[PDB]
From a paper:
The serine/threonine kinase CK2, a member of the CMGC branch within the superfamily of eukaryotic protein kinases (EPKs), is a heterotetrametric holoenzyme consisting of a central dimer of non-catalytic subunits (CK2β) to which two separate catalytic subunits (CK2α or CK2α’ encoded in Homo sapiens by the genes CSNK2A1 or CSNK2A2, respectively) are attached. Unlike many other EPKs—in particular its closest relatives within the CMGC family—, CK2 it is constitutively active in the sense that it does not require a phosphorylation or any other posttranslational modification for activation; alternatively, salt- and polycation-dependent self-interactions of CK2α2β2 holoenzyme complexes were proposed as a regulatory mechanism and experimental evidence of such interactions in the cell was provided. CK2 is involved in important cellular processes such as pro-survival signaling, cell proliferation and DNA-damage repair. From these substrates as well as from peptide studies, the consensus sequence S/T-D/E-X-D/E for CK2 substrate recognition was derived.
A frequent OCNDS mutation is the exchange of Lys198 to Arg at the center of CK2α′s P+1 loop, a key element of substrate recognition. In CK2α, Lys198 plus two further basic residues (Arg191 and Arg195) impart a positively charged character to the P+1 loop fitting to the enzyme’s preference for a negatively charged side chain one position downstream from the phosphorylated substrate residue. The asymmetric unit of the tetragonal CK2αLys198Arg crystal contains two protein molecules. While their C-terminal segments were not visible in the electron density, both CK2αLys198Arg chains were largely well defined from residue 2 to 333 and in particular in the region of the P+1 loop, which contains the mutated position 198. During structure refinement, a number of large and approximately tetrahedrally formed pieces of electron density emerged at positively charged surface areas of the enzyme molecules known to be relevant for substrate recognition. In the context of this study, two sulfate ions located at the “central substrate-recognition region” are particularly relevant because their binding sites are the P+1 loop, which harbors the critical Lys198Arg mutation, and the activation loop. At these two cavities, sulfate ions have been found several times before; in a recent high-resolution structure of a CK2α1–335/heparin complex, one of them—the P+1 loop site—even harbors a sulfo moiety of a heparin disulfo-glucosamine residue.
Numbering used by the authors: 2 to 333
Amino acid sequence: SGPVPSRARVYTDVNTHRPREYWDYESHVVEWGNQDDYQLVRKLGRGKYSEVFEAINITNNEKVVVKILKPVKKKKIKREIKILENLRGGPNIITLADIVKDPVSRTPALVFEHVNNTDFKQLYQTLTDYDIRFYMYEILKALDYCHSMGIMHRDVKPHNVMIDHEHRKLRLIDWGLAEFYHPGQEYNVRVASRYFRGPELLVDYQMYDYSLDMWSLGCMLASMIFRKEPFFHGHDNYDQLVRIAKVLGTEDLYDYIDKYNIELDPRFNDILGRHSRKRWERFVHSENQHLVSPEALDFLDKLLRYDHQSRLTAREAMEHPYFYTVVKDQAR
Ligand SMILES: [Cl-]
């Protein structure tokens, strides 16, 4: 008798009800643009999976961002393309503008809309309490959309949230690790940064769903309101769960493991130990108290649950009192 199966609480069957081609990305045929339309201007950064450049589309003098892909299986490229195309036009989702291939090297490049990003290592030091609520709400719009479209981002973290603070514009980017949710499908648990991995990934529970993104969002929120980046700073996959357990407690952890009949890696037995569930007040100090409020802590608590089924959905999260003033302002 192995682990208890799990199904997404919401948006469970959205992909089943769509045509096969919506989610069957291995069959996707890429529509290629003209690489000569783009002249690279300057290098913007290096990623795990790509080199990122600023470019100009010389056919319309539009500034774009070009991610030249490092070698990866074509099906992973098809997946990212299919997901980006499925989500195009969705709220706060980065827009894929073109897909080109260098005719000599055969290296593919994804061409995106440009976003005048403010560096989060300089932005987060200036964000107000209202700013955090505002941008969290904007992230939730993107997550509710992609979840409703049958897609888990699986790499929610500050580096994948581009913010043009001057225009109060937000884009959730870097969909190369996202996947389609299918009920009963088992997924890879080692895909994104450990600091934002939900406990289900850390205990190798593979039948997870959209709620993994909600854990990651909670980790982001904690780091923003407490000014501690990353919040759960584990040394490895095992230590990561210890860091969580020292805050959320081991009792809720073992209850979760028992409920889903999860076989815990023998390493965890020694290192997890016994820990009380702590109060969030212990992370509040004079440098971050202007960002911490009862509503922030209530919201954070409802995201950071071991049991993925008990975390707020993106839509429930948007109804939380933490966002009341944001919702009122956006309505006028
Ligand atoms: Cl959701």
